[PDB]
Amino acid sequence: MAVKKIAIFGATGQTGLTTLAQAVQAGYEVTVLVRDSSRLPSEGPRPAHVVVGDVLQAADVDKTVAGQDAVIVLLGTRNDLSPTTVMSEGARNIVAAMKAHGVDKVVACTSAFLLWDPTKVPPRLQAVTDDHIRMHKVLRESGLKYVAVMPPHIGDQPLTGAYTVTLDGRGPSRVISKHDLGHFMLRCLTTDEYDGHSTYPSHQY
Numbered sequence: 001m002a003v004k005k006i007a008i009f010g011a012t013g014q015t016g017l018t019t020l021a022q023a024v025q026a027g028y029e030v031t032v033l034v035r036d037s038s039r040l041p042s043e044g045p046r047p048a049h050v051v052v053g054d055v056l057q058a059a060d061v062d063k064t065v066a067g068q069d070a071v072i073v074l075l076g077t078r079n080d081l082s083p084t085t086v087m088s089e090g091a092r093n094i095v096a097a098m099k100a101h102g103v104d105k106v107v108a109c110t111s112a113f114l115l116w117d118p119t120k121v122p123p124r125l126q127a128v129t130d131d132h133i134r135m136h137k138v139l140r141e142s143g144l145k146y147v148a149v150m151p152p153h154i155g156d157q158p159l160t161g162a163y164t165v166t167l168d169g170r171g172p173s174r175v176i177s178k179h180d181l182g183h184f185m186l187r188c189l190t191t192d193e194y195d196g197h198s199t200y201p202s203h204q205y
């Protein structure tokens with residue numbers, strides 16, 4: 001049976017917005033959890049269901065995950081680089097809600113730093129990366145079908161659908177367009193080939 005209903009977390013972020021637009025255009029019935037609905041666009045494709053609330057509130061997460069076939073996680077801290085547990089605590093709530101509701105597929109974005117040499121993280125990004133590592137642990141220990149998406153720098157290049165996906169953080173480049181990253185997260189909904197793996201999408205634009 002194919003995935004039809006999905007929840008997206010972080011849909012108002014850079015990658016989230018284009019993942020959401022692509023998912024709706026592709027035919028998915030999409031639910032989003034957003035703190036502030038004014039951050040969703042009026043033009044273009046629109047989510048089927050909008051839950052207003054916070055990924056740190058279990059009940060809000062629960063309402064969002066109920067009834068879904070799969071979950072996409074594109075949480076982040078925007079330009080905030082201070083020490084943080086928002087992503088990992090959010091993922092804890094998502095896992096609990098998935099288990100409560102029988103949902104078994106999650107595709108979640110962290111970063112290529114979790115594949116590269118772990119002493120090459122730029123200092124200003126260490127705190128966020130530490131929480132990406134906590135989030136990754138939460139998801140891989142959940143006992144759910146988890147695709148870990150670990151992108152390099154996220155750019156603004158056009159959608160191509162022509163990027164390369166490796167399993168080790170080596171690839172044709174150190175950039176992926178936000179649109180291609182979103183396309184890849186949706187690709188992960190229709191294959192099991194990356195379940196239980198870490199993936200590195202990249203492309204030369």
Ligand SMILES: NC(=O)c1ccc[n+]([C@@H]2O[C@H](COP(=O)([O-])OP(=O)(O)OC[C@H]3O[C@@H](n4cnc5c(N)ncnc54)[C@H](OP(=O)(O)O)[C@@H]3O)[C@@H](O)[C@H]2O)c1
Nearest residue numbers: 010011012013014015054055075076077078111152153154
């Ligand atoms: N930037 C890069 O080059 C790069 C490269 C590799 C990996 N990454 C990682 O890739 C992931 C996606 O990044 P992005 O740039 O697309 O993200 P982003 O622009 O930071 O968007 C973060 C998203 O998370 C949502 N969010 C944050 N706190 C939340 C909360 N408490 N409750 C509900 N939602 C919350 C934000 O909502 P609001 O709209 O309400 O703020 C927004 O939708 C991030 O984890 C980032 O660290 C980034």
Ligand SMILES: Cc1cc2nc3[nH]c(=O)[nH]c(=O)c3nc2cc1C
Nearest residue numbers: 078079111112113125128151152153
């Ligand atoms: C190459 C690369 C750049 C990044 N920039 C980033 N920039 C940012 O503001 N937050 C991040 O979490 C972030 N992660 C990155 C991860 C990788 C692998």
